[PDB]
Ligand binder design. Structure first.
Ligand SMILES: [Zn+2]
Ligand SMILES: [Zn+2]
Ligand SMILES: [Zn+2]
Ligand SMILES: [Zn+2]
Lengths: 88, 88, 88, 88
């Protein structure tokens, strides 16, 4: 279950953070790697979508702790583009 | 008619606002939830598209009252990505 | 030929400008209306794509006159999203 | 192999840079031209995707040298939109 383990790893990493550029960088990276996972054919679409949603939830929570509103909208936009990218 | 009722609720909320980050946050949230509505299979595409257009119209009107041009373009971009997201 | 006439009208409007927020606003509006043209079924995809390209060329030229680099990238991104929006 | 030669030309250009707005401008331009390559029917999708990935890797490396984080996220977003644009 590569998608859920990647989401797991990235959620773990991100929860530790008290910097917002750092957490944003990591969230977008995790989303990139979630999309890369599907493109190579190594997990089904539904699994990647689940991972994206869980990672994004955690990342947006952290960002809201640090008050990083701009970054929150930026990650949501990227999440929506990533979401489109996965469904072919 | 879940889409129109969600658009209705969000239009109602947003019209009350005199803050631009608040109205922007709410518009994008409503658009997220409009897209989420379809993904679960709980309303047809045409209905969600209508809701997105009506919500976006109201939100952009409010934002123009408060002079929030940056946010206006940001919501339009998100509206277009959401629109793509709905049509599979 | 609704697409080319809309592009024509908007190119005409935009060439007159010496403000960059104004020209950007108008370019994005023209692109919105170009996409709206297709959605209603009132011109073929190829025609709208042509109009988008010509309008975007003119708008980016004007913006470069005024040195509005941020807006240029923003219009290009919106142009690419609009382009995706048209091809279903 | 038009895609790889375009990526090659642009990678060559970009490696020379010590300005971040310049390298960003060039990366996005190369990605535009990579997408334009496919639309005219002059290279297969897989080739353009390879070129986009290699160009983006180099550009993001340069940008990280110059500390241009905002531009990095902007190029990644554009890379994802370009990627969607290529797969029809
Ligand atoms: Zn990305
Ligand atoms: Zn969203
Ligand atoms: Zn638009
Ligand atoms: Zn572009």
């Amino acid at each position: 279950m590569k998608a859920l383990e990647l989401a797991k790893e990235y959620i773990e990493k991100i929860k530790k953070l008290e910097n917002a550029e750092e957490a944003f960088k990591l969230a977008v990276e995790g989303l990139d790697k979630l999309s890369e996972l599907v493109q190579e054919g190594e997990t089904e679409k539904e699994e990647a979508l689940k991972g994206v949603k869980e990672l994004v939830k955690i990342a947006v929570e952290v960002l809201k702790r640090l008050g990083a509103e701009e970054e929150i909208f930026r990650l949501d936009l990227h999440a929506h583009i990533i979401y489109l990218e996965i469904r072919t």
